[PDB]
Amino acid sequence: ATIGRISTGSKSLDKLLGGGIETQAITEVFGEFGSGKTQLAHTLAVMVQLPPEEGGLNGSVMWIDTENTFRPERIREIAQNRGLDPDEVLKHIAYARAFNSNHQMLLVQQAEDMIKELLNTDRPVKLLIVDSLTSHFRSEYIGRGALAERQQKLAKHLADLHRLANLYDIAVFVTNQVQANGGHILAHSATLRVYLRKGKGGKRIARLIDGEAVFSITEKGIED
Ligand SMILES: Oc1ccc2[nH]ccc2c1
Secondary structure (H helix, E strand, C coil): CCCCEECCCCHHHHHHHCCCEECCEEEEEEECCCCCHHHHHHHHHHHCCCCHHHCCCCCEEEEEECCCCCCHHHHHHHHHCCCCCHHHHHHCEEEEECCCHHHHHHHHHHHHHHHHHHCCCCCCEEEEEEECCCHHHHHHCCCCCCHHHHHHHHHHHHHHHHHHHHHHCCEEEEEEECECCECCCCCCCCCEEEEEEECHHHCEEEEECCCCEEEEEECCEEEC
C-alpha cells in the first residue's frame, strides 16, 4: 500500500509532520501531565473519518484506554464542529478499557480480528490508539530488580503494534507521560517521537525529537 496521512486539525502541526500522522507507522507523543496528549488523540479519532480532500481516510477507529480518560461527549463536540454527524462518528469507534498490563497485551491480539473483518469494506480500520501506553507497566514493575522484566514485556508489546501498522496499513498513535517525578520515553522503538509542552497563555508547543509548531485546544479539538 501507499503511505496514508491523517491531518491533526492544525495546519502548523501538519507542516511539522510532513502532512499529518502516517499509516504503516507508530507515532509516539510524550510530555507532562496536562500537556494535551489526550486532546490530540480525541481530535484524530474524528479527523480520520473525513474524506481525503479534507485530510481524512474514510477510516474506522479502535481505542485502548488505560486510565478512564475517553469522553464521548468530547467526541460529539469535535464532530459537530467539523461538519460531521456525531452519532455516525461514535458508531465507527470501537472502545475497550485495559484492566492491567497483561490484559492490555491481549487486547492488541484481539484487535486483529476486527481489523480483518473490516479490511474489504468501505470503512476499514485506519487508526489504532493506545492511551496511555506506559501507565500499567510503570505501576506494576517497581525497582531496579524488576526493570529487565518490564523491558521484556514492553518490547514484545511494541513489536505486536509495529506488525499491525505495517501488515494492515494502519496509523498507530500512542501517549506517554514523562515528568520529573517519574516516566520514561520508549527509547528508539516508535517510528516518530513528538515532544509536547504547555506555553504562555495556554498555547501548546510541539517539537520533533531526533522548528516548532504552535496550536490551541478549542471546540474543534485542536486548531492553529
Ligand atoms: O474486541 C475489541 C473491541 C474493541 C477494542 N479496542 C481495542 C481492542 C479491542 C478489541
